[PDB]
Design a protein around this ligand. Structure first.
Ligand code: SF4
Length: 271
């Protein structure tokens, strides 16, 4: 409720800018990110994001690549999926884990066609209210990615990042903590590029700020990372870490390419 929040706008702005520019240059190339950014029809775009999200929920990225492409190949739109049989879905789903998520995705498409005029609802709340199995996270991913709605989202990856960035050590499954992370995400989400921001936060968690041995030296957000600052302060305190020192013994002043140490070049030792 203090040092665990983003008190100054300037900092929010720096977090957004660093994360997004890192993302624009380092993000992995994934078929759903490509499809989504290239699709100009919002209903097809939202469906494409929806499928990838359901697929990613119970399975690793590496395997979703294989299935995602084949799935969209066969059913590139809500309408196409709406008229597939249960048996066809099972075959295309085989290897993605719990089948019901897949059956539920197809029944979702069918509901959109038969009760909603084929239109994907355009807001996170509306998307959560209407589509079966679509929770707060998936609704937010579709709305921010497909529609540009400024809604922040928190999955495991973002949670790991935010817990470190604001040094939150309380049990994350706690209700107070979840609500705090969601609050942070909602405050951080970039109003102009909320989709990329969400994808960037997740990507950071998946690539740089990993469960183990995180790549803090390559992290675009190291400066604003409360956990990082703390370990840096400890590392200095653990070694004896302490702007020329020999020089204070001046009058006539010695040279300004640092005195030696080194001591690199033909100089020294001049007893
Ligand atoms: S500096 Fe390290 S702990 Fe902090 S956000 Fe980056 S990867 Fe995570």
């Amino acid at each position: 409720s203090s040092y665990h929040l983003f008190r100054d706008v300037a900092e929010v702005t720096a977090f957004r800018g660093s994360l997004l520019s890192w993302y624009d240059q380092e993000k992995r190339d994934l078929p759903w990110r490509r499809r989504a950014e290239d699709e100009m029809d919002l209903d097809r775009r939202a469906y494409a994001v929806w499928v990838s999200e359901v697929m990613l929920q119970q399975t690793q990225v590496a395997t979703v690549i294989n299935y995602y492409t084949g799935w969209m190949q066969k059913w590139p739109t809500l309408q196409d999926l709406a008229s597939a049989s249960l048996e066809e879905v099972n075959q295309l789903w085989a290897g993605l884990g719990y089948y019901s998520r897949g059956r539920r995705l197809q029944e979702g498409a069918r509901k959109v066609v038969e009760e909603l005029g084929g239109h994907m609802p355009r807001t996170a709340e509306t998307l959560q209210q209407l589509l079966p199995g679509v929770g707060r996270y998936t609704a937010g991913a579709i709305a921010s990615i497909a529609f540009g709605q400024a809604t922040g989202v928190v999955d495991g990856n973002v949670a790991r990042v935010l817990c470190r960035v604001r040094a939150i050590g309380a049990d994350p499954s706690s209700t107070l903590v979840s609500q705090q992370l969601w609050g942070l995400a909602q405050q951080l989400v970039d109003p102009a590029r909320p989709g990329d921001f969400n994808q960037a936060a997740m990507e950071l968690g998946a690539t740089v700020c990993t469960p183990q041995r995180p790549l803090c030296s390559q992290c675009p957000v190291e400066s604003l990372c409360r956990a990082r600052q703390r370990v840096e302060q400890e590392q200095l305190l653990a070694s004896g870490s302490l702007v020329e020192e020999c020089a204070p013994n001046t009058g006539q002043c010695h040279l300004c390419l640092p005195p030696s140490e080194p001591w690199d070049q033909t100089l020294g030792v001049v007893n």
